[PDB]
Amino acid sequence: LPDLKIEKLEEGVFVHTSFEEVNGWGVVTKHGLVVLVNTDAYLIDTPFTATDTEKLVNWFVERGYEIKGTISSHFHSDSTGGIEWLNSQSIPTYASELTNELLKKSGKVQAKYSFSEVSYWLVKNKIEVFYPGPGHTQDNLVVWLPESKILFGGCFIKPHGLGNLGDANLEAWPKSAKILMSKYGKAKLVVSSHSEKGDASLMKRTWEQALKGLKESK
Ligand code: NA
Ligand SMILES: [Zn+2]
Ligand SMILES: [Zn+2]
């Protein structure tokens, strides 16, 4: 398995890439973000493991940042795998009510703090959380960095195919993608969990893949 990667996109924004073997898929590549506000660092999704989460935290703490918070974009272990370790270090973990419910229902450790706001500031004017509706999962949400015009679309953005459909809502995904396109068309950069970073068109590609996946199912 390749090592954890940490790449600077620009001032105060880093992409973390972690790797895991998943039954039926082989080696899954997973992207998340670390966002800096002054000397405060926020994790957008945890790596797959406690081990990679610790390495990621140490990399930023060693450079003089303090980890103020982590948010999980949905309940699957590629977003939530580090939550138990973060909870053991009293680093605050956040997830939607629905995500914390789906973590419980599936016998996994919950984020410490749950929210039900559809759209709100994680950090005022720096980090926005938005739920476009069901798609990849019932709970999937996105994170918006207004100052850098970067959207983190998580496992919702699927420009090359929908991946794992087990927890997906094919009926809703196309409407959810249209809602995301109307809200975040001014995006310079879209970071997805499982494909290369791209421009705002990745949201259209996802809509197209969602319509096709719906048609192929019915
Ligand atoms: Na700080
Ligand atoms: Zn997922
Ligand atoms: Zn995923």
DSSP code per residue over 112-130: SEEE--SEEEEETTTEEEE
DSSP 1: -
Whether the CB-CB separation of 44 and 73 falls below 8 Å is answered with yes
User: What's at 182, amino acid-wise?
Assistant: S
Task: Identify how the structure was determined.
Answer: X-ray
User: What's at 177, amino acid-wise?
Assistant: A
CA dihedral sign of residues 176, 207, 43, 84: positive
Q: Which two tokens stand for residue 132?
A: 């476009």
Beginning with the edge strand found earlier in the chain, give each strand of the sheet holding 119-123 in spatial order. Answer: 119-123, 127-130, 142-145, 150-154, 189-192
Q: State the distance from the centre of ligand 3 to the C-alpha of 149, rounded, in angstroms.
A: 22
To one decimal place, what's the resolution in Å? 2.2
Ion ligand 3: protein residues whose beta carbon lies under 5 Å:
78, 155, 193
* 1-218 to CATH, choices 3.20.20.70, 3.10.110.10, 3.60.15.10, 3.40.30.10: 3.60.15.10
Work out whether strand 26-37 and strand 40-44 pair parallel, antiparallel, or are unpaired. Answer: antiparallel
Q: State the distance from the centre of ligand 3 to the C-alpha of 74, rounded, in angstroms.
A: 9
Q: Which two tokens stand for residue 38?
A: 């002054």
Angle, CA of 57, 1 and 32, to the nearest 5°: 40
